C-alpha cells in the first residue's frame, strides 16, 4: 500500500496482491472538502470539491496515472487527460 498526504487530504492506493487495485480518498477539512467515488470497472477515481466534480484520476495497470479536469459546470470532462510524472505534480491534484 502507498499513502500520500497533502494538507488535510489523504490518498490511499493499495493492491490486494491478487491483481486488484482500489484507491481511497479522504479529507478532514470541513469546507471545500474533497471526496472520491471509485469506479473499479475502469479504475477511475473521481474527485469532487464540496460535492462538485473537478478531476478524474485513472489508475491503470500499466502503472501510470492520468488526470483530466471537468468543465466549470462540473458535468463533463475537458481537453485531454495528462500523465502524472512525479509526486510533486501529483500533490497538486489533491489541492
Amino acid at each position: 500500500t502507498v499513502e500520500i498526504k497533502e494538507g488535510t487530504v489523504t490518498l490511499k492506493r493499495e493492491i490486494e496482491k491478487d491483481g486488484k487495485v482500489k484507491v481511497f480518498l479522504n479529507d478532514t477539512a470541513g469546507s471545500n472538502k474533497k471526496t472520491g467515488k471509485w469506479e473499479d470497472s475502469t479504475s477511475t477515481l473521481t474527485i469532487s470539491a464540496d460535492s462538485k466534480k473537478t478531476k478524474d484520476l485513472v489508475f491503470l495497470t500499466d502503472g501510470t496515472i492520468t488526470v483530466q479536469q471537468y468543465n466549470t459546470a462540473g458535468t463533463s470532462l475537458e481537453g485531454s487527460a495528462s500523465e502524472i510524472k512525479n509526486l510533486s505534480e501529483l500533490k497538486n491534484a489533491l489541492k
Epitope: G30, D50, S51, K52, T72, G74, T75
Partner: antibody
C-alpha cells in the same frame, strides 16, 4: 431548514449603483455554492453567476461581467451582488438560490427575490 | 451557449386531463435538465432534477423523461393548484439557460 432572506424592493436612480443582500441560514454557508438570477416582468429567467463562499471564486455569465459582481461575508453568512451604473433595463426581480450538487445538480432553494426599480 | 425551446408556449386543459410539455435544446445535454414551477407572483420551485427524478414533496402525478435534445414533463389528473408557468433549465454547461416557459390555464 434552509432559509434565504432578501429585502422586498428597492428604488434607485439611473446611473447610480445598488447593493443586494441574501442572508443564508439552515446549512453550512462556507461549504456551499450560491447563485443569482434575474427575472424582468413576463420575460423569463436569466442566469447571472455562481460563487463558492469558501474562496470567493466566481463564474459569471459573460453578459453581466461588467455589470454585476458577486461577493460574500462568511462571518454573517451573507451573499451580495453589486450592480453598477443602472439603467431602465436593470429594473427587475433578483433572486439568490442555493445550488446543490452531488446527485442533484439543481437549485432547490430560492430567496423571495428583491424587486428593483430604476427611476428618477 | 445552449438555447432551450418549449412547446406549447401556452395551453388550456380541463381538470382531470393529462397534459404534456416538451422542451428541446440546441445541443446534446445528456440528462442535465431540470423542471421548475412558478405560480403568479411567487418563487420558482424545483419539480424534477436530472430529467426524471421527483423532488421531495412533489405529487407523484408529475413525471419527466428524455435525454439528448428532447425532454417532456407529464402532468396527469390536472388539479386546480397546477395553474402555473413551467420552465425547463439545462445545467450541461455555463451559462445556465432557461426555456421561454409554458403558461397553463384551466378550461371552463
Amino acid at each position: 431548514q434552509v432559509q434565504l432572506q432578501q429585502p422586498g424592493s428597492v428604488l434607485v436612480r439611473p446611473g447610480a449603483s445598488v447593493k443586494l443582500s441574501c442572508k443564508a441560514s439552515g446549512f453550512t454557508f462556507t461549504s456551499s455554492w450560491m447563485h443569482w438570477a434575474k427575472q424582468r416582468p413576463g420575460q423569463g429567467l436569466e442566469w447571472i453567476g455562481e460563487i463558492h463562499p469558501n474562496s470567493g471564486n466566481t463564474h459569471y455569465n459573460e453578459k453581466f461581467k461588467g455589470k454585476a459582481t458577486l461577493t460574500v461575508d462568511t462571518s454573517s453568512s451573507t451573499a451580495y451582488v453589486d450592480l453598477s451604473s443602472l439603467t431602465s433595463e436593470d429594473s427587475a426581480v433578483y433572486y439568490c438560490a442555493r445550488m446543490r450538487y452531488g446527485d442533484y445538480y439543481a437549485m432547490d432553494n430560492w430567496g423571495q427575490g428583491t424587486s428593483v426599480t430604476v427611476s428618477s | 451557449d445552449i438555447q432551450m425551446n418549449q412547446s406549447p408556449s401556452s395551453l388550456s386543459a380541463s381538470l382531470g386531463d393529462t397534459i404534456t410539455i416538451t422542451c428541446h435544446a440546441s445541443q446534446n445535454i445528456n440528462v442535465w435538465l431540470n423542471w421548475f414551477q412558478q405560480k403568479p407572483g411567487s418563487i420558482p420551485k424545483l419539480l424534477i432534477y436530472m430529467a426524471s427524478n421527483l423532488h421531495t414533496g412533489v405529487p407523484s402525478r408529475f413525471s419527466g423523461s428524455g435525454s439528448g435534445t428532447g425532454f417532456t414533463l407529464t402532468i396527469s389528473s390536472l388539479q386546480p393548484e397546477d395553474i402555473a408557468t413551467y420552465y425547463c433549465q439545462q445545467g450541461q454547461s455555463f451559462p445556465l439557460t432557461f426555456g421561454g416557459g409554458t403558461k397553463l390555464e384551466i378550461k371552463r
